[PDB]
Design a protein around this ligand. Structure first.
Ligand code: ANP
Ligand code: MG
Ligand code: ZN
Lengths: 336, 576
């Protein structure tokens, strides 16, 4: 415990930026994507209302882009550095497999349900690769899970409302395989506008072939391919069959308890800035934006500010958290 | 082990001497009074309360809580021995089964046959309820308390308790008490005369003499919020017998007291169930309009439309030429607009209602369904009320035909096993829909925007386009409210709609003539400016009669027609 206490007490630098920079060291670039993934790992917070309604605390993220821009590797990394995480691919899975299937027990002879992928990921993360190759009938199953965190089943003599609270991180490729600059984002993206309204943040990634950038990228890749582990000798081959990772896991695990709270200044800032953003959007056109901005934008801002405060372990949500949150969503929604 | 004779005397002492400071402290000895009523056949079941026993002998309470079955039998025998002392009166003959017993007495001059009472325990207040997951095998035979939701219930069946046979030759009778879930019947006479002579007389069973009890089977399931993370909920079988039948209902919260026991065979691992001993269930117009969804700014007349949807019109019923009173309306919403808050407010407000969504999710559908009996369906579960459909535009042809059938006949059909079963669906419908792409376009018709077929889409009495767009002050007000909420009388309304909906106001011929003139002028403007049809006239009648019902008045008046006219007229303005 003492290490995390003295580390958080330092307050010399923005710790969230250092933790984000240190995420997935093999993968070069993509700063904002790393920051958003860290917010997904930390999560927001739930809240309940006296009328019986409640506010969703978990975050969902979507990635779209060209070939060879490391989309798949980021998914394979999160799966290794988060507790209770599950993989899935769009072409290899069925709606029954995603939710729950009836099973005949050979010990007792009885019929009963068996958990699917999204149920097993309860209070965890589920990674969907190759999302654009799913049949729409499976997306109908995903809709209820992503909106309400529950899944309704009516089989094997049981009528039940199971628990499937999870964060979805998904990746896809654009229509025609390579993104087209002469078409709007809504034309390049193959999904329905109803489904695109459910994810918290949507990122677009492109292989801009600048030699200045290719220089450092190619150098970094080649450095990676010459490494050999210290426990291995000069000519060996394996058989078939910056913050350290350990500290990162421990710090994130402790930070998942803090449950910080709004402040009047942060609430005021978010309200005023949202009104300003709404006016700017009203002036703007679909030729210059990915999706419309509504109350869901306020929920996203609140979740992101909460997560940033959570990383500080500051019991209050502060102006710094709100400013960071709005900058992130501003970049995500209002860049070409 | 204890001497159960001494325990019997102790139980007798409790029944004879206990008074709860009862009948407002007059000390009238509750169980003595109960024994008088039992002796005079005024009452059948007797619930002995273990909190009363605890006042005298907590060790007896502990003795009862483990191996409860012994004490059930013990208390029953004690009550039978004490019953004649509290008798003073002769009871009138009132039952064929007792006429046989009376004949048996008359001819004579086992006790199980005569024992016409039931004895049950009410659990001690020390024992907190367990969840269905915490009733593990160390509780076999012990008294337990459980909490959950009911899922299914059978009809009431006659369960055999003691069989009575007659002999063809010797004229005697024989008895056979039943305890296990199965038994084997008798065949040939065991009486000494028949046996010694080997005369071979056969035994005939008499349903006029044997004793039967009301029996019913039930299942109970875990609450979803009590289930640990990443698990499937479990269920338990509960057997209801005697005066406890017909209390529970499907989908109802209950708390059950009972004994946990294993099932008898006909391996060392065996199924179990809960033996139930007690089941416990867990002006005016403007004011009421302003009371609907006060969280939402504006939309003044939409709230009044929803008010009249809840109040309803009148079924005219002239000799089969039917006009129905149920209002039905539909809301067309731009993407992400505030309609969800209003919809959920009406859903929360209404005393009997249900919700569903048009995408055809993995659960049960709009209509009823079959499992291995029939069950469910949003159209079914809302019956004497209103049902709400969300994202109506994503419905399938099955859904559209089901809604069409409900709109016409207010009933449905689902085949259990090829048989043509049919089922009530008397409720009103409220629909929510969204355009096919993006925001609604005023340059195109609503059919081109929402893209449901015109035949069923025009059924609704009212159509409203819920369109909204940014503005600095309104967005700031909304943001202030949402951030404030995140940082920090329905009974009267229900009683008002209860009392006012008793009215069925008629129309006089003067109002009919007035409506005729108004309607033809309205249709002239409609074609000059078409959508107007007979449906429009019936909608005007429905909303005006509904307003007349909202008033405490026995007839419709001019102001009701005028209000209905401006409401239907102004609804077009929402589309532009
Ligand atoms: N910035 C980078 N840092 C490290 N490796 C990179 C980088 N950019 C590309 N790569 C390499 O790209 C290869 C393919 O990665 P991958 O995640 O499959 O890309 P992708 O965007 O998912 N393309 P695709 O799966 O075809 O849609 C890997 O072997 C990486 O080594
Ligand atoms: Mg890849
Ligand atoms: Zn005989």
């Amino acid at each position: 415990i003492a290490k995390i206490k003295k580390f958080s007490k330092t307050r010399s630098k923005d710790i969230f930026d250092q933790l984000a920079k240190s995420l997935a060291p093999s993968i070069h670039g993509h700063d904002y994507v790393k920051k958003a993934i860290l917010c997904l790992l930390l999560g927001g917070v739930e809240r309940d209302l006296e009328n019986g309604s409640h506010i969703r605390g978990d975050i969902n993220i979507l990635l779209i882009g060209d070939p060879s821009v490391a989309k798949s590797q980021l998914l394979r990394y999160v799966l290794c550095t988060a507790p209770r995480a599950i993989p899935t691919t769009g072409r290899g899975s069925s709606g029954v497999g995603l939710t729950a299937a009836v099973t005949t027990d050979q010990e007792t002879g009885e019929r009963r349900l068996e958990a699917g992928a999204m149920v097993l990921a309860d209070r965890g993360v589920v990674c969907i690769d190759e999302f654009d190759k799913m049949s729409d009938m499976d997306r109908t199953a995903i809709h209820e899970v992503m909106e309400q965190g529950r899944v309704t089943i009516a089989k094997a003599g049981i009528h039940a409302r199971l628990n499937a609270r999870c964060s979805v991180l998904a990746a896809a490729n654009p229509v025609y395989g390579r993104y087209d600059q002469y078409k709007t984002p809504m034309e390049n993206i193959g999904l329905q506008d109803s489904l695109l309204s459910r994810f918290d943040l949507l990122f677009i990634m492109l292989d801009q072939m600048d030699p200045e950038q290719d220089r450092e990228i190619s150098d970094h890749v080649l450095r990676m391919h010459r490494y050999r582990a210290p426990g291995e000798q000069d000519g060996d081959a394996m058989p078939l069959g910056m913050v350290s990772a350990a500290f990162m896991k421990k710090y994130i695990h402790v930070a998942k308890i803090i449950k910080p709270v709004l402040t009047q200044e942060s609430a005021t800032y978010i309200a005023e800035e949202y009104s300003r953003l709404r006016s700017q959007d009203s002036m703007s056109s679909d030729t210059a934006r990915t999706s419309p901005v509504t109350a869901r934008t306020l929920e996203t801002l609140i979740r992101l500010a909460t997560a940033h405060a959570k990383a500080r372990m500051s019991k209050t949500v502060d102006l710094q958290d709100a400013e960071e949150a709005v900058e992130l969503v501003q970049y995500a929604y209002f860049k070409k | 082990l204890k001497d159960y004779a001494l325990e019997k005397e102790k139980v007798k002492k409790f029944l004879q001497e206990f008074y709860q400071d009862d009948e407002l402290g007059k000390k009238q000895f509750k169980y003595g009074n109960q024994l008088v009523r039992l002796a005079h056949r005024e009452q059948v079941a007797l619930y002995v309360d273990l909190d009363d026993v605890a006042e005298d002998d907590p060790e007896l309470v502990d003795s009862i809580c483990e191996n409860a079955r012994r004490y059930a039998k013990l208390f029953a025998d004690a009550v039978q021995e004490l019953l004649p002392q509290y008798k003073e009166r002769e009871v009138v003959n009132k039952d064929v089964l007792d006429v046989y017993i009376e004949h048996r007495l008359m001819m004579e001059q086992p006790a199980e046959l005569m024992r016409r009472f039931e004895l049950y325990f009410q659990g001690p207040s020390s024992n907190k309820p367990r969840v269905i997951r915490e009733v593990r095998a160390d509780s076999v035979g012990k008294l337990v308390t459980v909490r959950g939701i009911v899922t299914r219930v059978s009809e009431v069946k006659p369960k055999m308790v003691v069989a009575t046979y007659t002999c063809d030759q010797c004229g005697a009778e024989t008895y056979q008490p039943i305890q296990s879930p199965t038994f084997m019947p008798l065949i040939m006479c065991p009486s000494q005369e028949c046996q010694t002579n080997r005369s071979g007389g056969r035994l005939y069973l008499q349903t006029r003499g044997s004793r039967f009890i009301k029996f019913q089977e039930m299942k109970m399931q875990e609450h979803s919020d009590q289930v640990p993370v990443g698990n499937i909920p479990r269920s338990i079988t509960v057997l209801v017998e005697g005066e406890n039948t017909r209390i529970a209902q499907p989908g109802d919260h209950v708390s059950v007291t009972g004994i946990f026991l294993p099932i008898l065979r006909t391996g060392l691992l065996s199924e179990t169930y809960l033996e139930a001993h007690r089941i416990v269930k867990m002006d005016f117009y403007e004011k009421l309009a302003a009371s609907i969804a006060p969280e939402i700014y504006g939309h003044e007349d939409v709230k009044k439309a929803l008010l009249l949807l809840l109040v309803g019109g009148v079924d005219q019923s002239p000799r089969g030429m039917k006009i129905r009173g149920n209002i039905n309306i539909c809301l067309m919403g731009d993407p992400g607009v505030a309609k969800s808050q209003l919809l959920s407010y009406i859903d929360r407000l209404a005393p009997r209602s249900q919700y569903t969504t048009g995408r055809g999710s993995s659960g049960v559908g709009l209509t009823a369904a079959v499992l291995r009996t029939l069950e469910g369906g949003a159209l079914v579960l809302a019956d004497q009320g209103v049902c709400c459909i969300d994202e109506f535009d994503k419905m399938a042809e099955a859904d559209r035909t089901a809604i069409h059938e409900v709109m016409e006949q207010q009933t449905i059909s689902i085949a259990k096993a090829g048989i043509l079963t049919t089922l009530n669906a008397r409720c009103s419908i409220l629909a929510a829909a969204n355009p096919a792409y993006g925001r609604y376009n005023p340059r195109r018709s609503l059919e081109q925007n929402i893209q449901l077929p015109a035949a069923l889409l025009s059924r609704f009495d009212l159509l409203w386009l819920i369109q909204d767009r940014p503005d600095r002050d309104n967005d700031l007000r909304l943001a202030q409210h949402i951030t404030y909420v995140h940082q920090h009388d329905m009974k009267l309304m229900r009683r008002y709609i209860a009392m006012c909906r008793e009215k069925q106001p008629m129309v006089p011929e003067s109002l009919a003539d007035y409506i005729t003139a108004a309607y033809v002028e309205m249709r002239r403007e409609a074609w000059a400016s078409t959508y107007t049809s007979a449906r429009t006239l019936l909608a005007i009648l429905r909303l005006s009669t509904a307003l007349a019902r909202l008033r405490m008045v026995d007839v419709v008046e001019k102001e009701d027609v005028n209000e209905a006219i401006r409401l239907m007229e102004m609804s077009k303005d929402s589309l532009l």
